[PDB]
Paper text:
To understand the mechanism of its RNA binding activity, we determined the crystal structure of DM15 from human LARP1 to 1.86 Å resolution, using the same construct we used in the binding studies. The crystal structure contains four copies of DM15 in the asymmetric unit in two pseudo-dimers; ∼98% of the amino acids are ordered and visible in the experimental map. Superposition of all four copies based on Cα positions yields a range of root-mean-square deviation (RMSD) among six pair-wise permutations of 0.29–0.95 Å, with the majority of the differences appearing within the C-terminus of the construct. Our crystal structure reveals three structural repeats that correspond to three DM15 modules, which we have found to exist in nearly all LARP1 protein sequences. The structure of the DM15 region reveals a positively charged patch containing conserved residues. While it is uncertain that LARP1 exists in the cell as a dimer, the crystallization of the DM15 region as a pseudo-symmetric dimer revealed a positively charged cleft comprised of the concave surfaces of two monomers, which allowed us to hone in on the probable RNA-binding amino acids. We reasoned that the co-crystallized sulfate ion mimics the interactions of the phosphate backbone of a single-stranded RNA binding with an electrostatically positive surface. Therefore, the position of the co-crystallized sulfate ion, in addition to the pattern of highly conserved hydrogen bonding donors and acceptors lining the patch, were used to position a short polypyrimidine sequence on the concave surface of the monomer. A putative TOS-like sequence appears within the vertebrate LARP1a primary structure in amino acids 928–931, which are contained within the loop connecting α7 and α8 in the crystallized DM15 construct. Interestingly, the putative TOS sequences within the non-crystallographic dimer of the human DM15 crystal structure presented here are approximately 50 Å apart.
Residue numbers in the entry:
A (entry chain D): 797 to 925, 927 to 943
B (entry chain A): 796 to 942
Write the structure that this text describes.
Amino acid sequence: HPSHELLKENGFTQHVYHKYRRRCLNERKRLGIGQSQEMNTLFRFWSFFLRDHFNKKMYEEFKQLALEDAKEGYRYGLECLFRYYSYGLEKKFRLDIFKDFQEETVKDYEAGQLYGLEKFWAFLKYSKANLDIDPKLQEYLGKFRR
Amino acid sequence: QHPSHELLKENGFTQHVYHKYRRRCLNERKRLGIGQSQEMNTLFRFWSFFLRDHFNKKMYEEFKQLALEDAKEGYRYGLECLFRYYSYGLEKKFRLDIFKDFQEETVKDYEAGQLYGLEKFWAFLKYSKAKNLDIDPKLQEYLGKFR
């Protein structure tokens, strides 16, 4: 499966990927949001690949599509994105993505979900790291733990 | 202070304290609407933890009913708590009837287009020492494509 060849050490080619991505996005369109298991492989691919091989362009598309699916009630993409945030920022902290992590966690919370908040809390527990947390987010974390 | 904490202590559970806490959470759900109640979310989490070592059939059935009602409206916390109760709880103390429920809810979750339940079922199979598991034929198909 291209999903896996591409994650092997130096096994990524921008040719295999383009074909694979094009194919997944087409099944999503053909079958409907949340209906393509192949699209789900791409969400998983992005979640893992971006941790070691950050590509701003891939990342932006990852987030945009995860959120579109989530708006219609299909969580897997967004669940994959929160795992990217939590596990990736642990290994290689970076400030912009951490800011995005906070913003998407707040949005997830205000939409009545807790998946994102638990991932954020878990990140802080395992984080080695001077963190400045959004006031709203500290507030939400406090309530969650009661 | 919050009843959730007290009820989970060793020997901390009483019917009276639980009844008032449950009533309160359900009242907030009825007032704010499905998935709009943070108190209800603490109750889902309580159930998920408490039922592992203090299984109660009537409590479990209400947990499952409310989790599925909420998930229908798109609010998934209750069901996520239920799947964690299934995945972790059955590894610790296997119950055949609950395992059959776990299979049923996983198949439903997958056919509704989610993978949270399937991943938790997968994780249970990876860690369980139970032998001779009879797993739903369609669920085996789904597990196959998944991992």
